[PDB]
């Protein structure tokens, strides 16, 4: 897996070149965003249970067929698995946010997830909807201007949105 830094390194190594002054400066700018990235990971993690439960509640309210008898999230084991998956995906999204690179999310969580779900009969579109609900809640929590030093977090918030969207597409 890569982080924002080693992503650049690996690209440079395959070309056998030193990082350019432009690339180094791009990393310096990333370093300048580090505190915002740490806060964003902290804020999502601090609210993880709420993000998952509220998104799952909203999801089943919109898709009652999931929780009717015979539905894919019906029975405790399957509901429990569904809630577990929502948290796994959120957790890996926070991993990607922490590292600044999607490789952890892609390599460990999403790679092969669609196939697992298709084989199981898990409705991918409903998972994607759930991920979208978690995304909205997470972005609001990150952007909340209270109790934190004020500043512009649009760049980090956009990166997090991309990670959530990756997860949604990977299963949708």
């Amino acid at each position: 897996m890569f982080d924002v830094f080693t992503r650049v390194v690996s690209q440079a190594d395959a070309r056998g070149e030193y990082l350019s002054g432009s690339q180094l400066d791009a990393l310096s700018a990333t370093v300048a965003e580090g505190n915002k990235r740490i806060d964003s990971v902290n804020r999502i993690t601090g609210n993880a249970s709420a993000i998952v439960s509220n998104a799952a509640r909203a999801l089943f309210a919109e898709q009652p067929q999931l929780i009717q008898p015979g539905g894919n999230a019906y029975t405790s084991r399957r509901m429990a698995a569904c809630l577990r998956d929502m948290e796994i995906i959120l957790r890996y999204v926070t991993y990607a946010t922490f590292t600044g690179d999607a490789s952890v999310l892609e390599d460990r969580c999403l790679n092969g997830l669609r196939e697992t779900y298709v084989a199981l009969g898990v409705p991918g579109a409903s998972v994607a909807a759930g991920v979208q609900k978690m995304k909205e809640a997470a972005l609001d929590i990150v952007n909340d201007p209270n109790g934190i030093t004020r500043g512009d977090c649009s760049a980090i918030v956009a990166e997090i949105a991309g990670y959530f969207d990756r997860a949604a597409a990977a299963v949708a």
């Binding site: 390599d107 460990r108 092969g112 669609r114 196939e115 697992t116 298709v118």
Partner: protein, 266 residues
């Protein structure tokens, strides 16, 4: 197939392909498009050098002297086709290439191989190639004016179900070609009249989690195994192992005398 499956299987572009027909009083552009499509199909999407083009056959088609089916046959009989697909290939690889190129499908059964091996032994290359283009299957799908196109991913009248699964062995993706000879991936399953799992597009992928080692890569080893240790429950087995354990797994399989049929990234 529909988007939901075609996207996973890497065959969206095949599904949206439209048969190309040479109409009466076609323009020069339409003839050009048809010639390009024939070269792409019959030559399995190789990069075609200008020195390899059939100048004369192209002229005759453009002059409406010969039909599209005649032009397909001219290309199939050409030295270009021979050099690409016949002179350096074993016969069974050559035959499945003819089925892909000329009928747009994979072979259905071993007897198709036997028929065409006999025909080559009897009448040589020209008789073998003409059998495809003159067949009822060619005439009823493409006639004289439609460029052949791949059909194996769609339910055809009088096909065998295994034609669909086998299509993924001979069609490897849009940006692929039948250029390197080689052996047929179909030999065993044709000979024994069986099928093999479809690992194409993104269906080869499997979950990694924390179990995929230092490179976060799993490899899928498909083996044929017997009991020559613990009890063997299936004659056909798959193992998922990380990069770090791949050498150990090969050595284990090797020590047991079991046969590796395929390995790929998962």
């Amino acid at each position: 197939t529909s988007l939901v499956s075609a996207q996973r299987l890497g065959i969206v572009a095949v599904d949206e392909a439209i048969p190309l027909e040479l109409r009466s009083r076609s323009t020069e552009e339409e003839v050009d498009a048809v010639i390009l499509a024939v070269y792409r199909q019959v030559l399995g999407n190789d990069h075609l050098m200008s020195q390899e083009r059939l100048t004369s056959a192209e002229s005759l088609l453009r002059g409406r002297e010969i039909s599209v089916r005649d032009f397909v046959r001219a290309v199939a009989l050409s030295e270009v086709y021979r050099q690409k697909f016949f002179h350096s290939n074993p016969q069974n690889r050559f035959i499945e290439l003819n089925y892909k190129h000329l009928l747009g499908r994979a072979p259905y059964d071993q007897s198709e191989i036997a028929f065409h091996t006999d025909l080559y032994h009897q009448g040589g290359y020209e008789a073998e190639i003409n059998s495809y283009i003159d067949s009822v299957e060619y005439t009823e799908n493409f006639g004289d004016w439609v460029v052949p196109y791949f059909r194996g991913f769609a339910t055809q009248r009088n096909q065998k179900t295994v034609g669909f699964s086998r299509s993924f062995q001979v069609y490897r993706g849009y940006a692929t070609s039948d250029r390197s000879g080689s052996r047929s991936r179909l030999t065993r399953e044709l000979a024994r009249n069986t099928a093999s799992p479809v690992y194409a597009g993104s269906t080869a992928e499997s979950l990694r989690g924390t179990s995929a080692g230092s490179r976060n890569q799993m490899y899928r080893l498909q083996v044929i195994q017997g009991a020559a240790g613990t009890r063997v429950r299936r004659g056909k087995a798959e193992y998922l192992v990380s990069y770090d354990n791949l050498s150990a797994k090969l050595q284990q399989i090797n020590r047991q005398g079991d046969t590796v049929t395929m390995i790929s990234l998962a």
